[PDB]
Amino acid sequence: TYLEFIQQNEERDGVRFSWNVWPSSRLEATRMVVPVAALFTPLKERPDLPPIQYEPVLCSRTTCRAVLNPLCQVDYRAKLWACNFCYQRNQFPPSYAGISELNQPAELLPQFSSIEYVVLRGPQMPLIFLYVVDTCMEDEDLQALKESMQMSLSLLPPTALVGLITFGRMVQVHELGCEGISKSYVFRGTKDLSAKQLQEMLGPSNRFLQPVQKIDMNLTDLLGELQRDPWPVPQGKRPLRSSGVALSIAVGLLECTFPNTGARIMMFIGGPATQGPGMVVGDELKTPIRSWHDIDKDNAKYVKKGTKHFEALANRAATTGHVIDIYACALDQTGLLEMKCCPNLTGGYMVMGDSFNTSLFKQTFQRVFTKDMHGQFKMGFGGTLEIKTSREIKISGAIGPCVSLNSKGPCVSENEIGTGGTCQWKICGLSPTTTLAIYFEVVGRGAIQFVTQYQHSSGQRRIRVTTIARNWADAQTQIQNIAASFDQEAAAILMARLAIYRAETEDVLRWLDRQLIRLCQKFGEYHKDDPSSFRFSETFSLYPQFMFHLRRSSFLQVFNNSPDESSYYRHHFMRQDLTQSLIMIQPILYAYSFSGPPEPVLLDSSSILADRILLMDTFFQILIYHGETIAQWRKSGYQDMPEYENFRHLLQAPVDDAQEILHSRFPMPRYIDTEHGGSQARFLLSKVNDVSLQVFMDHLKKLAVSSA
């Protein structure tokens, strides 16, 4: 069954294709409404995975060089294997001279289609964490940030290198380990510096990046008594905050000291950049920070030049191999829109909150440093993703956290999509949850090989190889065989990433609408000019509902959100796997009442029963709504009475069913406890319901049965 096929291939190969049967003819290949594409998670964790400590077998053809995989034809008599990509016959390495049929290399077993190698040859480089701390914030927010900083230091491996950069009006590069003097290098937060300049003006471990095993005592005292930016903030003006210059010096410090190795630049800001390059807003409170309304009317002259500065640093950091995080906690906006390129081009994190002094941020931040069962971080660095395809398959491009290495080859498609024109991408930061979207193009079985070389948090250099295969469409049942292999959940997300990518680099909904109608006209059953006759198979019937919620989501309709909230939402959507992405587009709704156990219901205002308790899961918030009669017998203070204990099982069932995933999701969702009449029930009413799904479906069927 083709649903078991989808789940078993995502669990083993970390891959979700929009189509699992591919077109064998050029006409159907170009008449492909939804592109042949895959949601690929390079480092998806596995329950029974054994590290393979040997160099990967490589096809002995200079152009091919594909990794030995369970799709190759082997001859255990002649010690010979035939490559499945170019058919070049290869002598087995001397290390495989004794391999047998009863005992085969693990790389040839179908259960190890996804396999990881450990390449131990060169001396391992330690991890690097550079804290870039903003001091323009109230002491409550500063001390709380300091507290959660010293907590992250306590989790770092002793061999890890740490640096500290504090900034406000000026920026300070601290040289830790100094005795009796505690010295730092002060720079003007109004002039941008190149990496060569910073190297000259400053003079394995540095004076600024030292092993936490030998300077954590000196750091915990500096961090402990770090104080607010000393410069006075006049009445009616913002603090002078040089966030753009502070970043370029954090980037430049690592560029001239530890290039081409793993390192995280962690910038903690409590407001927008109001000075120097990267400026987001002027320093007068009377003129507000730019909104989407201001962006449309060109009443925001800082966002264009401010963006160019940060995407310059982003491409500098991605070329050097470093990752950039942004932890923004402020009551007002902070400039994520202009700075989003730094954690987006790299694999960096983006965390947003109202204050560092909240349980929301402090727990979100310690989730960055969660360890596995070996006590090692769940982060990887310096990833190089090279994709090899069969002679038919060409790569259009990748959507997600990556940067093109611009390596040309025969598998590079001329029709570029997103980060294209290459078969290799650099992902400076990735976790077991990082998900790319690769888009393919067809110009028996077709094979694709994903090779991800990265630096593990332990210092080992590893190579994860994933070789997949999908059947070519047999031409006597071409459209029928392909239609049954449709993955409507994957296609909707893969099409969503296309829409978001065009919107964030600009009408988008017109393209989204026409592709939905074309998909209805090709794979739907109907008689012409009778909308009542349109029906979708079990393979497609959920796709229109997904598009209905996508074209109304905050990812595409950005007004009613601040420009930083739209960047934040899109940031996390371009990295998540299928499960969490569907939750983002279409929230999940569970019901709680006396009449039955909890159960999922539909996202419609016919489910907001007064008699029930709802559990809504948007990826970004977990809400528990209390109906009319529900809020009434709760306001009555009747849970405390002992003869209604079934009472207590109802009001705390969603609270208990919230905590278990309120701790697994990396960006800890906001928690809500609202009822009817409360001002926080708006989030439920807006996600619930052109007009509505009923009206949307009628218009879709009216247009799907008329002219194509």
Added chain:
Amino acid sequence: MVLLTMIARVADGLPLAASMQEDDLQQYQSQAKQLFRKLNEQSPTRCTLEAGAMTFHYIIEQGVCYLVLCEAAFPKKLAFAYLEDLHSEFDEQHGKKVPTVSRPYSFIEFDTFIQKTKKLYIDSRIMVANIEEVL
């Protein structure tokens, strides 16, 4: 959000203490010395004086004027609240000795208390008239 503080004996305009930090001051203290001479036994007890974009606040107690200069956009209500902190401390320490002195800035060492209590102001964490009329 910026500064100029002066304390003078109202009878003769004799300076007692002051606090000034630049890194203008030439024109702005000259009119403070001019107002210090115009004050007498008939002057308003508490007054606020506007110099275009700047603003004067002064109080007079025990024949001692406590003047502060500051641009207009500063909260008037808190400006008097700090001059209360100055007048109280001065009256405690040298209020017994202010009709006795004759040398200018006899209590110039009081400057060590003026800048510290004003950093407790410049940081967030009565009559109306124009100066060109009084002079």
Added chain:
Amino acid sequence: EGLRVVNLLQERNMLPSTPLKPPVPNLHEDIQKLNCNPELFRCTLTSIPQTQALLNKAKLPLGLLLHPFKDLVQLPVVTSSTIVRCRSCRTYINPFVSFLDQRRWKCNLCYRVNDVPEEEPHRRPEVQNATIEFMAPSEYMLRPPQPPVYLFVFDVSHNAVETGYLNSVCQSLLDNLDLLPGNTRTKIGFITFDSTIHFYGLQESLSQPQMLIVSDIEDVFIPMPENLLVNLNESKELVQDLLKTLPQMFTKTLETQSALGPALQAAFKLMSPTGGRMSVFQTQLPTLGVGALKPREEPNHRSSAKMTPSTDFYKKLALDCSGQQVAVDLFLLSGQYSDLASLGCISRYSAGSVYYYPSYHHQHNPVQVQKLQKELQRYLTRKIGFEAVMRIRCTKGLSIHTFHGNFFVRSTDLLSLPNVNPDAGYAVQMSVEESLTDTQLVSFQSALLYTSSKGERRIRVHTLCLPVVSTLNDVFLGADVQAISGLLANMAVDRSMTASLSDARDALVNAVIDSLSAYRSSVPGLMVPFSLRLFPLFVLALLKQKSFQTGTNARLDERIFAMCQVKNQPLVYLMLTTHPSLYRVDNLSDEGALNISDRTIPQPPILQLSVEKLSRDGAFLMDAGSVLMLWVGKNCTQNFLSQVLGVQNYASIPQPMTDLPELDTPESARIIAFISWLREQRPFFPILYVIADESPMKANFLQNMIEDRTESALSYYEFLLHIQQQVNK
């Protein structure tokens, strides 16, 4: 006394055995008794020429030498609510005024009659004291009395670390931290610099002082709005901790380039809002950033006279420091050429002072270590005035046209003195713009307005009255040979920079030729008046001083610093350095001043600076003002070696002998008594060195024998023969 005429070729022993006293002006007894102390204010001609024609005929310079801020024993201070001044020229009321109507006084400077206010007016303290200090009212200050601020700027390059000077400087600051002039308002700050500028924050809030480095050399700034210039009293403990730390922070540095220019720009920006005293310690040629100076080859004995700064940078910067009441004192502890001709400008135009310690090293040069020790003691503890201003007024008809000293002259001849130190001497040249036909007396009054270390505006005033004469002979009869030599020394320094060293030397020789030639044409041998019998001797001593000598082994920074001392030291110490006092100290007698109750203090006869006065059988002491050298003969007595030196023979005297031992012999009790009498006549403690024996590589004692011959300088008798040939041409 004597209206007598001297022939300098027959006497040849014209120097007295008693110290030279300044000539008493030929004034009435009741007027001279009120005249100011001559060491505070003196004139080259105690008898002022009536006309400019008469002054030109004498070929002698007319000018004043003054020591306005000298430490006084008794200073009358009047706190009058009002101050009395001539309403037309603002001359302060002075003893040399004349009261006419007992309600009207006749100012002695501009001849406008003024009314005395209702506030026996003739014998108020302002008319009974030429030297007097006033309490300035509120209109004599442009701002509240500034606090005392002391910013120290240390070079900490690799060469600076090797010299080890920072140890003594920091230890001296520790010992004299409570003795710096000031009240509770005392500010202090510290800046170190190598290829970058290092600021230091002092917060009682944190465990350690902070070190903020500014590396942007071409654009310096202040890294913190506070805690850089800290109130010394409230953060005393943290300033002490920094001083105990600085000498050990750069022990293994490898920075060889010094960015002195940028460091001073940063230092200027720091004390710009308040002013104060900037103490700069530099050990090498600045080579990085603005103010960089090119290296220069040092001269030798064969190089002819053949001085000026290389760039105007340190002059422009000093003028910026002057406008913000910032004085820059430059301590140069260099072992190689550092272009002091350009660095010294930072002190010249900021009313600071230059201090020089050639080839300073904490181990190899024990002389400079103890000289920096005693010079830092006086520097850090002597009184000080801030944001000071000085003006010199003279009676109508006399015009000052040239100023000499460390200051900045502004419009209407106003001397800006950001700091005024009690060891600064100034000089002035004046001429007769209009004849003094009507007047018989003229007056000169300097007023020094400053802010004391306690925050009170002061005005120190000196007034000098002199007679006016109308003949050539009377002009010569009132000539001050020492004041003339001093003013001539300052004029030659300016000539050496305007024109060359040879031109400066010719002008010094011609000053004696033309003057004596004019006297000869007013009367067989070289005939001079009694007042100028020592004129060729002292001018010869000028031409062999380090400032103007030729065929010497002197280096550029040595000569330049010698000229800085000429322009900055008072006259009394120019004479002690140029023509040191020579006494025989191997047999002292009871002919001295056994008056100070229990102390002898003998009075040995002053000997002339010739090796012919020496003798290999005794030991003689030479007083060069700043240092006392005791040459001991190779065949000295057995009594002197053991009873005053504590040594059994000439060969066992230690080579570096930093002081005499206080042995218990009336011979040692003797020699310690007369040396103790000369030392307490001075501000900077003169160390004494008795290591000068036969060949201890310290024979500079003989170069102060300015009456002897060398292969590069004339002897005194040859100098007289050279002068006579030109007086009788």
